[PDB]
Amino acid sequence: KPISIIGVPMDLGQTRRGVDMGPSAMRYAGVIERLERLHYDIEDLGDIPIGKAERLHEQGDSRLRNLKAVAEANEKLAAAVDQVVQRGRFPLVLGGDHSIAIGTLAGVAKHYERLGVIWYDAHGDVNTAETSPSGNIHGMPLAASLGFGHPALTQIGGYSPKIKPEHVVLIGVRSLDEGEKKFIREKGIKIYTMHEVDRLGMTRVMEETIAYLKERTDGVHLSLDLDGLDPSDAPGVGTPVIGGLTYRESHLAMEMLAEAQIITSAEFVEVNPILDERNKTASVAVALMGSLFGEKLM
Amino acid sequence: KPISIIGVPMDLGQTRRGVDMGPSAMRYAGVIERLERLHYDIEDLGDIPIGKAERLHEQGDSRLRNLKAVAEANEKLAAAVDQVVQRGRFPLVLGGDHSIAIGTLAGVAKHYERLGVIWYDAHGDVNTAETSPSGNIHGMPLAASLGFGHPALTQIGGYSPKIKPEHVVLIGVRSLDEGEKKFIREKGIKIYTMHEVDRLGMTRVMEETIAYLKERTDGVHLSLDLDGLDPSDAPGVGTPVIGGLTYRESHLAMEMLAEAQIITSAEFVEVNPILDERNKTASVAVALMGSLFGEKLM
Amino acid sequence: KPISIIGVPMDLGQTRRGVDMGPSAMRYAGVIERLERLHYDIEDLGDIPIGKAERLHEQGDSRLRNLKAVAEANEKLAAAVDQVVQRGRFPLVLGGDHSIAIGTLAGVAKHYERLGVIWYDAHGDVNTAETSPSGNIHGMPLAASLGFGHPALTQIGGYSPKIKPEHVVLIGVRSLDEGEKKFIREKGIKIYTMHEVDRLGMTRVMEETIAYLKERTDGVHLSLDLDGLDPSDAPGVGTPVIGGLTYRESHLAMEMLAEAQIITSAEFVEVNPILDERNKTASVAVALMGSLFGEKLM
Ligand SMILES: NCCC[C@H](N)C(=O)O
Ligand SMILES: NCCC[C@H](N)C(=O)O
Ligand SMILES: NCCC[C@H](N)C(=O)O
Ligand SMILES: [Mn+2]
Ligand SMILES: [Mn+2]
Ligand SMILES: [Mn+2]
Ligand SMILES: [Mn+2]
Ligand SMILES: [Mn+2]
Ligand SMILES: [Mn+2]
Numbered sequence: 007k008p009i010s011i012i013g014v015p016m017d018l019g020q021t022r023r024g025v026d027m028g029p030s031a032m033r034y035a036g037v038i039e040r041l042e043r044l045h046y047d048i049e050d051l052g053d054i055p056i057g058k059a060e061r062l063h064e065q066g067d068s069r070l071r072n073l074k075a076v077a078e079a080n081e082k083l084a085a086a087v088d089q090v091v092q093r094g095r096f097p098l099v100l101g102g103d104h105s106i107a108i109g110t111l112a113g114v115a116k117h118y119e120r121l122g123v124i125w126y127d128a129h130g131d132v133n134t135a136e137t138s139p140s141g142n143i144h145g146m147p148l149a150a151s152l153g154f155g156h157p158a159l160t161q162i163g164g165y166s167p168k169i170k171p172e173h174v175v176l177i178g179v180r181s182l183d184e185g186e187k188k189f190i191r192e193k194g195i196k197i198y199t200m201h202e203v204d205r206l207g208m209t210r211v212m213e214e215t216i217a218y219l220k221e222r223t224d225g226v227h228l229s230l231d232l233d234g235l236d237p238s239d240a241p242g243v244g245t246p247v248i249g250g251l252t253y254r255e256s257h258l259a260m261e262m263l264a265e266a267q268i269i270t271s272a273e274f275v276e277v278n279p280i281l282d283e284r285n286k287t288a289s290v291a292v293a294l295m296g297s298l299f300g301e302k303l304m
Numbered sequence: 305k306p307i308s309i310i311g312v313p314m315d316l317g318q319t320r321r322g323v324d325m326g327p328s329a330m331r332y333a334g335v336i337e338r339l340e341r342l343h344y345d346i347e348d349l350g351d352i353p354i355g356k357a358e359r360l361h362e363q364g365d366s367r368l369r370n371l372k373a374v375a376e377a378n379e380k381l382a383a384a385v386d387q388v389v390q391r392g393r394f395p396l397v398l399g400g401d402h403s404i405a406i407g408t409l410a411g412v413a414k415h416y417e418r419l420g421v422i423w424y425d426a427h428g429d430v431n432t433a434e435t436s437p438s439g440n441i442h443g444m445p446l447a448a449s450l451g452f453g454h455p456a457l458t459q460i461g462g463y464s465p466k467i468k469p470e471h472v473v474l475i476g477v478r479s480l481d482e483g484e485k486k487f488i489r490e491k492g493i494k495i496y497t498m499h500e501v502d503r504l505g506m507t508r509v510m511e512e513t514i515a516y517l518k519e520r521t522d523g524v525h526l527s528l529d530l531d532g533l534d535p536s537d538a539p540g541v542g543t544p545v546i547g548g549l550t551y552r553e554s555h556l557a558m559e560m561l562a563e564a565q566i567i568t569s570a571e572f573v574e575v576n577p578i579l580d581e582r583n584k585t586a587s588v589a590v591a592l593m594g595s596l597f598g599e600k601l602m
Numbered sequence: 603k604p605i606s607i608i609g610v611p612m613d614l615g616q617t618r619r620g621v622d623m624g625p626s627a628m629r630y631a632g633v634i635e636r637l638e639r640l641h642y643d644i645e646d647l648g649d650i651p652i653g654k655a656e657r658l659h660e661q662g663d664s665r666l667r668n669l670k671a672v673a674e675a676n677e678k679l680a681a682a683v684d685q686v687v688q689r690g691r692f693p694l695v696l697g698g699d700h701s702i703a704i705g706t707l708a709g710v711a712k713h714y715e716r717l718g719v720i721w722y723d724a725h726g727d728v729n730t731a732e733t734s735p736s737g738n739i740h741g742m743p744l745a746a747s748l749g750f751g752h753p754a755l756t757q758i759g760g761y762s763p764k765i766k767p768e769h770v771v772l773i774g775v776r777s778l779d780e781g782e783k784k785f786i787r788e789k790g791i792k793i794y795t796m797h798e799v800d801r802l803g804m805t806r807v808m809e810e811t812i813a814y815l816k817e818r819t820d821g822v823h824l825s826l827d828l829d830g831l832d833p834s835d836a837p838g839v840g841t842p843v844i845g846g847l848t849y850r851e852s853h854l855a856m857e858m859l860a861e862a863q864i865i866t867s868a869e870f871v872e873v874n875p876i877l878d879e880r881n882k883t884a885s886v887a888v889a890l891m892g893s894l895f896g897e898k899l900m
Contacts, residue, residue, distance in 0.1 A: 209503050254547055258502040303478050303497035304485055451659050465659055491660075 008047035010090040014054045018072040019105025019144030022244035024280025029100040031279040031288035040296045069135035077158040080109030084163045087113025101275035107147035112163035114271045122173040122223030127231035128247040130186040137185025175215045178234040181247045208255040212262045228272035242282025260297035306345035308388040312352045316370035317403025317442030320542035322578025327398040329577040329586035338594045367433035375456040378407030382461040385411025399573035405445035410461035412569045420471040420521030425529035426545040428484045435483025473513045476532040479545045506553040510560045523568035530574045540580025558595035606686040609649035614668035615701025615740030618840035620876030625696040627875040627884035636892045665731035673754040676705035680759045683709025697871035703743035708759030710867045718769040718819030723827035724843040726782045733781025771811045774830040777843045804851040808858045821866035828872045838878025856893035
């Protein structure tokens with residue numbers, strides 16, 4: 007299936023500037039060339055125009071920083087993504103902080119009876135204005151897409167929820183706020199924290215993950231946050247957490263998903279060139295994209 | 305069985321100068337002392353005299369750079385190695401780029417009904433003048449040993465092929481040229497790329513490898529290319545490839561081979577002091593040799 | 603009946619290179635011109651694409667050299683010949699070593715209830731992998747067509763055998779392997795060695811041959827190997843044998859066949875320009891073809 011790249015230069019979902027440079031950092035890391043080599047009909051639809059956020063002061067919720075700019079950008083993203091899917095193409099969204107997942111899922115989900123989600127991340131991203139300790143919207147996209155949160159975020163695309171909790175699998179988690187641990191526990195979301203990764207091994211985690219979703223979804227969206235990898239492998243992220251997944255574990259995961267042929271959409275987020283070591287993180291993202299799309303060693 | 309060390313100061317198999325210093329770097333990294341401690345009768349036969357290759361433009365060799373010099377040095381190596389085996393000693397060859405495998409296997413194979421080969425490397429080294437993208441002979445030793453390539457290389461020692469495809473096991477591969485992928489596929493060579501190492505685990509890979517060769521060979525030659533380890537573990541190599549085997553995985557491999565008692569000859573190649581970090585790579589090689597030769601933690 | 607020429611530039615059936623130049627040597631010798639003069643609707647379908655054999659050391663059995671390439675080439679030939687017959691034309695096949703008879707007979711035989719065969723040769727070509735003293739497939743086409751040999755050769759065309767031993771007549775034989783003498787003896791194949799040609803005379807041998815086949819077949823294929831003539835008359839052959847048939851004996855034979863009107867298909871093989879004296883052998887072939895197709899002195 008032909009691919010369509012959409013860049014979302016977003017940084018309003020959090021506070022470290024530079025994550026808005028992720029789309030071009032990955033383009034510069036050679037994402038087009040990489041995918042063209044795999045004989046893909048790759049197309050670059052450019053970037054979603056993001057508006058500058060109103061200053062905190064006259065702005066409404068500190069528990070929902072930059073809500074309007076974030077909500078509007080995601081509206082545009084949802085539309086762009088919706089059209090790509092309608093055109094029969096695979097939407098590959100490049101971020102940008104994780105709050106863009108709200109728009110990506112808003113444009114994809116409407117097209118599936120039961121869309122599953124693989125949330126590759128160090129965080130759960132299931133906070134609300136009530137549970138969020140930062141007010142950073144990049145820490146709320148999964149909950150908002152599950153129908154939990156401010157209507158400005160939950161109603162993107164004119165419908166909700168975008169997905170069901172039983173159709174979500176979290177991988178590489180190692181930093182959850184108390185409210186989030188409770189949310190995960192109660193909504194019954196499937197999750198493999200680093201303990202399970204260390205205990206079971208990435209192979210078993212991926213096998214179980216793929217089998218689980220394949221048995222109850224009709225499309226799977228890969229929401230890959232680069233901070234899911236160890237800061238040593240992916241240094242250029244705004245909210246890094248030590249003791250993460252390795253470069254190899256990430257490739258195996260992508261390779262196993264490629265093989266499974268279950269990934270119907272994807273987004274690579276949180277790449278921040280301004281916090282990286284010579285574009286290393288964008289590079290990792292591009293390599294991981296290659297594996298996801300079927301690149302093989304043999 | 306007594307060991308005989310033969311240094312092969314070869315760099316004509318590729319383009320990065322310095323890999324000819326590999327033999328002395330490893331000697332300086334303490335190869336003799338290491339092996340003597342395991343109570344071996346270790347002997348150092350010095351180095352094979354390598355002649356400088358004539359100008360590429362003057363002698364015909366571009367898809368086969370330095371063919372004359374590489375072919376003759378390997379002739380000498382073949383003889384030296386043949387004699388060591390005849391004397392009832394184990395030939396431990398220190399390189400030198402990987403093209404020296406052509407001479408080592410040329411002197412060992414004639415002594416075995418079915419010699420097996422474990423090719424520990426990031427590459428397959430199964431290119432021919434036709435498939436080679438570089439013209440570097442260090443990327444052709446395995447194919448040449450299997451009887452595929454220029455006669456100047458396939459006929460070293462007055463016979464061919466030195467080994468059969470079904471008796472070869474590649475491990476750690478993560479960079480194969482298209483022609484090579486096809487070669488491996490068609491010749492039916494057993495291979496464990498990094499995907500299999502990540503998926504199955506080094507223990508499994510080594511168990512399967514040892515059992516496979518043990519069931520159908522009468523001797524096994526270990527051709528260990530230091531670039532099979534990750535560049536962070538083995539930085540001093542001319543053609544590094546990221547996402548490689550770890551220091552520990554390599555020690556386990558060597559430890560399990562020692563245990564199986566199947567390795568009848570070996571060569572440690574691609575050590576280049578001029579691209580290393582304080583002889584780190586020669587050091588890893590020496591350590592790995594200690595394990596191979598039975599060194600144990602307990 | 604219109605004629606259709608099909609060149610089969612094959613030399614994989616034996617070891618002397620050059621016999622693949624036979625088709626063009628005969629064309630240059632003027633085969634088209636010769637036949638057009640007899641007012642035939644002659645058509646050249648070009649040549650069958652022949653692949654390059656795989657390395658001898660990687661081949662399955664040394665008693666069946668180049669089996670794959672020889673088997674595949676014969677598959678294409680059988681198809682080409684089959685179609686010619688279907689179009690109501692006479693297939694005239696130009697070789698190429700004698701292994702091509704396997705393809706020719708595979709395309710013709712299916713169209714007859716009882717196809718007879720006249721094998722004009724110094725050899726019997728009835729060897730198998732077991733009885734072959736050379737491993738050369740050009741020494742096995744008759745046996746394989748009789749259904750005896752490797753399935754790769756006996757099953758060309760999807761059926762077997764192509765002919766019955768009682769419908770075969772050998773002429774000019776003077777070099778048979780022991781296994782072959784036994785085969786001919788036991789399968790009860792009719793044969794006129796040079797002893798019979800010297801004792802009875804070519805006229806009697808032909809009279810007897812034509813009457814024998816005419817009484818029990820519905821079509822006769824002429825498999826004329828140029829080495830059936832004496833090396834003085836036909837020097838350009840890879841496996842010459844002295845004391846063969848003369849130029850005149852061969853013309854008489856062709857003249858008596860034309861008269862008999864029994865030949866429904868034919869092939870002229872083993873012409874090798876690289877072992878000839880100024881295209882002398884291709885020239886004899888062409889002349890012989892002229893007589894076969896009715897050319898007369900008066
Ligand atoms: N996307 C990262 C979210 C970080 C943190 N758990 C928060 O809610 O602020
Ligand atoms: N020994 C390294 C070889 C690398 C590459 N396949 C080449 O043939 O150039
Ligand atoms: N077509 C020539 C055959 C020669 C010999 N009888 C052989 O089997 O090699
Ligand atoms: Mn996230
Ligand atoms: Mn994260
Ligand atoms: Mn190598
Ligand atoms: Mn290598
Ligand atoms: Mn013959
Ligand atoms: Mn003959």
